[PDB]
């Protein structure tokens, strides 16, 4: 079918999403120490058990 469609709009939405820069945050430990951080996050002190359990909730 058609092959000579407009090209004017190539790059449209990336070049019109407003920039917002990354935010500066505490650096996360690398290696072993991160696996540790996961262990205590996941399994040691736990967090919630609303119905079951979650991992990336926001407002619930």
């Amino acid at each position: 079918a058609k092959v000579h469609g407009s090209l004017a709009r190539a790059g449209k939405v990336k070049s019109q999403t407003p920039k917002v820069e990354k935010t500066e945050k505490p650096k996360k430990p690398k290696g072993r120490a991160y696996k540790r951080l996961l262990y205590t996050r996941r399994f040691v002190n736990v967090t919630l058990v609303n119905g079951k359990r979650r991992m990336n909730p926001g407002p619930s």
């Binding site: 072993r32 696996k35 540790r36 996961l38 262990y39 996941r42 040691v44």
Partner: protein, 185 residues
């Protein structure tokens, strides 16, 4: 024109990439023995795997077959040697049983913690990789050292570093060079 310098790999990946249950069970191992990689678990479960194969293969030959008795005994004694296998179940249907944590329990990592001397699996790592602790007078800086029963008795800090005496070492020796320089002359 040389002899092929031979290698081989020492780990194996899980068939299924995202099995939530194996995933939990895996981290928990790391959390418990202070690992940094799933590989450190992959490594062992692979070791374990072949051992079982050796054991299976041997178990299908007849009882009191020559290879079976030779290769069977050899396997068992080597396992005992590092203190994985129980003195009682020293007859390879428990090498057939066995499991990963029986292996994990013998890393220098884990021994250097088990009888105090670290009081955390992680502090256990850091000490080992930092040239402290040794087996004889021979310093060991590899957490997966697999403590061989008859070496367990001789796990102390090394005759170097602090802890095992013979210097505090530069970062303290720095602060001690800040006391008789500021306050004194």
């Amino acid at each position: 024109p040389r002899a092929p310098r031979t290698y081989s790999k020492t780990y194996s990946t899980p068939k299924r990439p995202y099995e939530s249950s194996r995933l939990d069970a895996e981290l928990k191992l790391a959390g418990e023995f202070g690992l940094k990689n799933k590989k450190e678990i992959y490594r062992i479960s692979f070791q374990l795997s072949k051992i079982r194969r050796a054991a299976r293969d041997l178990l299908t030959r007849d009882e009191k077959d020559p290879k079976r008795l030779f290769e069977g005994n050899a396997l068992i004694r080597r396992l005992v040697r590092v203190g994985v296998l129980s003195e009682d179940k020293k007859k390879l249907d428990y090498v057939l049983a066995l499991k990963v944590e029986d292996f994990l329990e013998r890393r220098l990592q884990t021994q250097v913690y088990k009888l105090g001397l670290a009081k955390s699996v992680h502090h256990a790592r850091v000490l080992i990789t930092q040239r402290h602790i040794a087996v004889g007078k021979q310093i060991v800086n590899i957490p997966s050292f697999m403590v061989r029963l008859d070496s367990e008795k001789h796990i102390d800090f090394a005759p170097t570093s602090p802890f095992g005496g013979a210097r505090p070492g530069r970062v303290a020796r720095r602060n001690a060079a800040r006391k008789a320089e500021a306050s004194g002359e």
